[PDB]
Write a protein that binds this ligand. Structure first.
Ligand SMILES: O=c1ccn([C@@H]2O[C@H](COP(=O)(O)OP(=O)(O)O[C@H]3O[C@H](CO)[C@@H](O)[C@H](O)[C@H]3O)[C@@H](O)[C@H]2O)c(=O)[nH]1
Length: 397
């Protein structure tokens, strides 16, 4: 399995992974998250944990269960931490704590290393036994809702360490080690592997999208932080100068997002009037369909208001597509302004750069190549895996 990555990263990184893994062969490692299918965390763990096993680590991945009430609370925490907005009643904290207790009763926590992914299972640390506990934060916690952060910091401050996606998310109100590890893409997954043109054509055709006209694509949940409405507004402004252009918004449900269905309707509303707008909702693990659309796209957008990293940016850059990205969080380490695409602060700036890229085929192609090179150097699964092993070795001494 690992030997296959030599092509992309060279012998020296593969040697490094083997020597780190050799030191860790005797350790039991648990990963805990809140979703089995959908979202970036499940995307990482579905590839990362099997690779840990290939290297001879005793790695397990557990998904917590919860009610709709629990996932309503966790999503409100998610939005509050990233945006600093909203009212959070004390009832939310009681619901949160009860589901930590329920899950703790059904998870064996006495692993050498426990990785807790994102806020949903952070409270499990109350029931810790032996071993090293690491909190893996996938979101923007630079400017959080003080009530939600106050509550969660009570748990995080009990961890042995913390991983954030970029240094800028490191907290000055935590004294535990805060390690920056960017997420990555697995070039060998069905999400990112080469596709034959016949498959790309067939999937784009199936969804009624014109393969002969430009495609502007955003792959994202119907979530306010992804700004599907602002993407529609970007498209409307740009279509004035590229009237043949089409917009594809490709969304899909996650287990732990109970408002994915609500935001659709204000997207559909904002879309009514335009017929080259395609609002797709695909089942979980529609890997090949996302792959195909990313390969069909002329330009890809990830115009997030808030973003921990945004795997969809690296997925597009790897397939040699330039990205127009929201000027926020981990998008800024993937989109090198004027090299791998453009960082934008408004739909107006998004539209400006959409028209520029649609009118400049040679620039698109060169930015595409620079994107793939930037992902190759920085955001492949081998790099993320090596930093995980390094983090474990450090934090277990
Ligand atoms: O219809 C869809 C929409 C998305 N995806 C995939 O789902 C993932 C989405 O990941 P990302 O764009 O990163 O978003 P989140 O689900 O919000 O992921 C969280 O965790 C990720 C990993 O750390 C970070 O990149 C994010 O910023 C963070 O919010 C990618 O693999 C997408 O291809 C699909 O397969 N189908």
């Amino acid at each position: 399995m690992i030997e296959r990555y030599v092509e992309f990263v060279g012998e020296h990184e593969i040697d490094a992974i083997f020597k780190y893994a050799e030191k860790l062969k005797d350790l039991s490692i648990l990963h805990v998250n809140s979703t089995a299918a959908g979202g970036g965390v499940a995307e990482i763990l579905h590839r990362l944990v099997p690779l840990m096993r290939e290297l001879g680590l005793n790695a397990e991945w557990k998904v917590i269960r919860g009610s709709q009430d629990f996932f309503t609370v966790t999503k409100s925490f998610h939005n509050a931490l990233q945006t600093g907005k909203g009212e959070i009643p004390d009832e939310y904290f009681k619901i949160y704590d009860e589901w930590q207790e329920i899950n703790a009763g059904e998870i064996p926590l006495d692993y050498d290393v426990v990785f807790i992914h994102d806020p949903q299972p952070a409270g499990l640390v109350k029931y810790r036994k032996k071993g090293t506990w690491i909190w893996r934060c996938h979101i923007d916690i630079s400017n959080p809702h003080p009530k939600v952060w106050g509550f969660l910091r009570g748990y995080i401050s009990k961890y042995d360490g913390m991983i954030v996606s970029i240094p800028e998310f490191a907290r000055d109100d935590l004294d535990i080690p805060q390690i920056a590890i960017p997420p990555s893409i697995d070039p060998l997954s069905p999400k990112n592997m080469p596709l034959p043109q016949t498959t790309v054509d067939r999937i784009v055709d199936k969804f009624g999208v014109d393969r002969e006209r430009p495609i502007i694509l955003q792959v994202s949940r119907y979530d306010r932080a992804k700004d599907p409405v602002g993407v529609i507004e970007s498209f409307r402004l740009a279509k004035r100068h590229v009237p043949d252009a089409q917009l594809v918004y490709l969304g899909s449900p996650a287990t732990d997002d109970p408002e994915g269905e609500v935001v659709y309707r204000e997207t559909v509303e904002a879309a009514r009037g335009e017929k080259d707008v395609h609002l797709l909702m695909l089942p979980p693990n529609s890997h090949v369909e996302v792959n195909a659309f990313q390969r069909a796209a002329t330009v890809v957008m990830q115009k997030s208001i808030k973003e921990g990293f945004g795997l969809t940016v690296s997925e597009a850059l790897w397939k040699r597509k330039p990205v127009i990205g929201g000027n926020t969080g981990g998008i800024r380490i993937q989109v090198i302004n004027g090299v791998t695409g453009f960082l934008v602060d408004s739909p107006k700036a998004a539209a400006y750069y959409l028209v520029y890229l649609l009118k400049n085929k040679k620039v698109r192609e060169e930015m595409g190549e620079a994107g793939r090179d930037h992902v190759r150097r920085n955001f492949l699964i081998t790099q993320q895996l090596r930093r995980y092993l390094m983090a474990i070795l450090y934090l277990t001494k």
